[PDB]
Design a protein around this nucleic acid. Structure first.
Lengths: 44, 181, 187, 30, 134, 98, 76
RNA sequence: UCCCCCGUGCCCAUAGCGGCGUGGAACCACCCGUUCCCAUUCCGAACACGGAAGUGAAACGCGCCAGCGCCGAUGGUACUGGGCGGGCGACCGCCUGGGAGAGUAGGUCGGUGCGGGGG
RNA sequence: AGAGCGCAAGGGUAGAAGGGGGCCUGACUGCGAGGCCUGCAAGCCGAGCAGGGGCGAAAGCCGGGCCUAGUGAACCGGUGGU
């Protein structure tokens, strides 16, 4: 699948890849947004 | 528990009799029991892990030790196995773990086996090791009757500081090991 | 078998051949030297003797040496030797090949077969004193399909072998014929 | 706890494992 | 046989390793010319020799044809030969032993091999055993 | 099992070959690139008591006094077969007390 | 006649022979697996590309069982 | 300067496999134990901790040993930069200069740097 | 080391790149020394710096997977933000 994670409390993004079927229902991994430094992200 | 009736059988009865049949030079040559490694190769209860728990914990009653599991390697499609679902209940005991279990064995386990003429003395593989299998495992002291829902059997394992099995045949027996001769 | 030995040095390899003088070498633990022996003389000496009988080598020094033909390199394309080796002996135990003789006819050939001799010589570890010209092998009771291994030979005094005592000396084989040809090119 | 093996043929053995109420039936002494 | 499929032509370079020493039997037969001996060629010899001395001696085929001789079906250029018409061949280079005989006196193993050579393309040369071993 | 003794070598300089016996505890500041050890503070090759870790603590500061007296700093620790823990970590203790 | 294919040759091998001045961090050897390795001032990356970590001369050492390494000795 | 042991580098089998043998004063190993740190898919086997008593058997250190592996000439050749002559071709031969593998002779159960203990 | 290392092959590899477990997500942002390859375009390798982190006692290691296929100039359009 084609995926791009978004930032909480904001709207940052990054390149990524989903897999759907296989163990990939939830997706909340950490990153390094621009506005400030370091927060959590999502799926869709 | 560094004291039990079969621990000193070796110490004060079997050790000096082992120097008589061979005569060594160093005290650390006399063949020494020191490594029993029981195993349960039940591919039978492969599908459900439900019976697996009842077999291991039940195994803990006789072994008296925390039991672990061995995973399989290849892929026996012919009896339906792939990665590592297969199960073998392994539990290695040393020190006085074995000395308390082997006491329930030669004095309480073997005799109460259905028609037991004697052990099979062909089971010496060459090195100072020895092996044997069984069916009904309820031939054990703690295991009762209204607790067994299947007669799943096992096969044990014994190590010794013995090079030649002719030394093994003299060590095990002296500790109270009943063979068929 | 004696043979006049000659000393070679810088002389080009091939040019010696254009003299009928086959180049060669003698050597051992205590020696190394280039040589060259006449081909005709060599030939007559070698044929009869080969790598079993010992061949003495007379140098322009009045020297007699107890050499053995460790190896001999031949020129593929019209069997003819290019180079010879000579192993100088002393009187310490040494390995070499010894000839073979098979007396009488087996219960094979006498009935109808063919003697398939695998070796004509066996490897032995022996001193220059003892150099048996042949090792008897009573191949009388060798039925078709049987064979005599290295573990049963007429080993003379103080002559221990050098190859595996399980290695086979020879075998009695089935005679191939026309009666087979109907079944051979058939199925 | 030092178990208690009470089989039909005397031979009351004392060893080490759970519940010292091991009613054995014809052990090694028979 | 196993190997795998069709192989390349190659070149009959010199005589280098193509050459031997009689290893089995009394007499011997060896090649003077380089060439591509076929299967049915060797067969043509195998038979003849045995048809000479029925209930005679044992024959040894020292060479062996493991080179896929290729060919094309009467047309032109698409793809490489399905070949295998003649079958599989042996690279035979001058000095190479090809047929060993035994259990047969001179006049036997002499008129046996010679015949073979006449079912054979190249030129041949029967051999005794001299003494040249190794 | 000398995988650990491997990587450290490519790192930097001034190693610390910590080797602990059964009651003893050696240690070596060995400058690779030639095979030459400088200070090698011993334990039961020295004169110390017999309490392993207790003796292991002291076998660290004994290096510090011979470390700055030859001018060393690089802490480049080598952990051979032994896993970072006791008689092998109280090896760092005093050797990192200062 | 499915047989007319091949792979764009990747042009591998060594690229800086022993005794040769190499600038700060240029390439030395592009290899398949581990025919070579790092060495004094010689890092490498994903494809197994040996290069320099400094300037200096390239040199080839041979350590039998241990394999073959290629390092640089600098001058400063 | 010299000998033993310990740690650790260097060449990468001429170091290795196997055999016999010798060491417990020092040193190393085993070992006593699992209270502590700490550990096992289960087990103090490995990892780990506290320590005397016992030993050299194992592990190891050191020799002797050639049966295996390994190493392996000289000579000759094959092949061959380069030059040139013969034949229909498959090919062949000479000059110049280079020159393997294979095998033979035979070699080996090795060498040394720094640091530390010890007479 | 004839296994394994997702899949063809190859080189490679146990002195780990293979197998299990713990904690984690550097399948980072901002640049890029110097080269590999190369007609162009393109592909490729990467020391190191800054910020902010991750596993580790530390040394350190991390800009996805042992590596080499798993792909598409540009134009024209889709959604988000500054």
């Amino acid at each position: 699948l084609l995926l791009e994670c978004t930032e909480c409390k904001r709207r940052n993004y990054a390149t990524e890849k989903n897999k759907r079927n296989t163990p990939n229902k939830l997706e909340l991994r950490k990153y390094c947004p621009w506005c400030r430094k370091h927060t959590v992200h999502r799926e869709v | 528990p560094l004291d039990l009736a079969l621990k000193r059988k070796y110490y004060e009865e079997v050790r000096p009799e082992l120097i008589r049949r061979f005569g060594y030079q160093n005290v650390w040559e006399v063949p020494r029991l020191e490594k029993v490694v029981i195993n349960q190769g039940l591919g039978e209860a492969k599908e459900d892990a439900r019976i697996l728990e009842k077999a291991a914990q039940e195994l803990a009653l006789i072994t008296g030790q925390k039991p672990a599991v061995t995973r399989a390697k290849k892929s026996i499609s012919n009896f339906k196995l792939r990665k590592g679902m297969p199960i073998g209940l392994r539990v290695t005991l040393r020190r006085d773990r074995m000395w308390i279990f082997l006491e329930k064995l030669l004095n309480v386990a073997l005799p109460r086996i259905r028609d037991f003429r004697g052990l099979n003395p062909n089971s010496f593989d060459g090195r100072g090791n020895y092996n044997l299998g069984l069916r009904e495992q309820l031939i054990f002291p703690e295991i009762t009757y209204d607790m067994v829902d299947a007669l799943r059997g096992m096969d044990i394992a014994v190590v010794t500081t013995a090079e030649t099995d002719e030394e093994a045949r003299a060590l095990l027996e002296l500790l109270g090991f009943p063979f068929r001769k | 078998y004696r043979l006049k030995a000659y000393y070679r040095e810088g002389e080009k390899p091939s040019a010696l051949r254009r003299a009928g003088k086959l180049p060669g070498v003698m050597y051992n633990r205590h020696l190394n030297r280039k040589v060259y022996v006449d081909l005709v003389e060599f030939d007559k000496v070698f044929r009869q003797a080969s790598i079993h009988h010992v061949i003495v080598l007379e140098l322009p020094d009045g020297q007699s040496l107890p050499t053995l033909v460790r190896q001999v390199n031949l020129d593929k394309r019209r069997r003819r030797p290019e180079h010879v080796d000579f192993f100088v002996l002393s009187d310490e135990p040494v390995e070499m090949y010894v000839p073979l003789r098979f007396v009488g006819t087996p219960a094979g050939v006498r009935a109808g077969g063919v003697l398939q001799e695998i070796h004509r010589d066996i490897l032995v570890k022996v001193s220059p004193r003892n150099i048996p010209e042949f090792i008897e092998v009573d191949v009388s009771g060798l039925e078709i399909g049987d064979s005599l291994h290295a573990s049963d030979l007429k080993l003379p005094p103080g002559v221990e072998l050098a190859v595996s005592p399980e290695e086979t000396i020879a075998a009695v084989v089935p005679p191939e014929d026309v009666e087979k040809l109907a079944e051979e090119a058939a199925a | 706890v030092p178990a208690r093996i009470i089989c039909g043929c005397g031979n009351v053995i004392e060893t080490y494992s759970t519940k010292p109420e091991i009613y054995v039936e014809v052990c090694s002494k028979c | 046989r196993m190997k795998y499929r069709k192989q390349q032509r190659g070149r009959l370079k010199g005589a280098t390793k193509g050459g031997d020493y009689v290893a089995f039997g009394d007499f011997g037969l060896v090649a003077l010319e380089p060439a591509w001996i076929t299967a049915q060629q060797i067969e043509a010899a195998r038979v003849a020799m045995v048809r000479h001395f029925r209930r005679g001696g044992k024959i040894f085929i020292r060479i062996f044809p493991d080179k896929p001789y290729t060919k094309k079906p009467l047309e032109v250029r698409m793809g490489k030969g399905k070949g295998n018409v003649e079958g599989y061949v042996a690279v035979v280079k001058p000095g190479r032993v090809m047929f060993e005989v035994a259990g047969v006196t001179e006049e036997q193993a002499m008129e046996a091999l010679r015949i073979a050579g006449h079912k054979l393309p190249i030129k041949t040369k029967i051999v005794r055993r001299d003494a040249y071993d190794e | 099992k000398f995988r650990v003794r491997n990587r450290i070598k490519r790192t930097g300089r001034l190693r610390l070959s910590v080797f602990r016996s059964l009651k003893h505890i050696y240690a070596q500041i060995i400058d690779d690139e030639k095979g030459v050890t400088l200070v090698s503070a011993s334990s039961l090759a020295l004169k110390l008591k017999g309490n392993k870790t207790e003796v292991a603590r002291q076998v660290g500061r004994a290096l510090a006094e011979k470390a700055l007296a030859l001018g060393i700093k690089q802490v480049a620790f080598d952990r051979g077969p032994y896993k970072y823990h006791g008689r092998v970590k109280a090896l760092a203790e005093g050797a990192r007390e200062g | 006649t499915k047989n007319g294919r091949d792979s764009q040759a990747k042009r591998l091998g060594v690229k800086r022979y022993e005794g040769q001045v190499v600038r700060a961090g240029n390439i030395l050897v592009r290899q398949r697996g581990t025919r070579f390795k790092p060495g004094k001032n010689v890092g490498m990356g994903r494809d197994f590309t040996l290069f320099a970590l400094v300037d200096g001369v390239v040199e080839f050492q041979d350590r039998g069982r241990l394999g073959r390494y290629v390092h640089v000795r600098p001058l400063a």
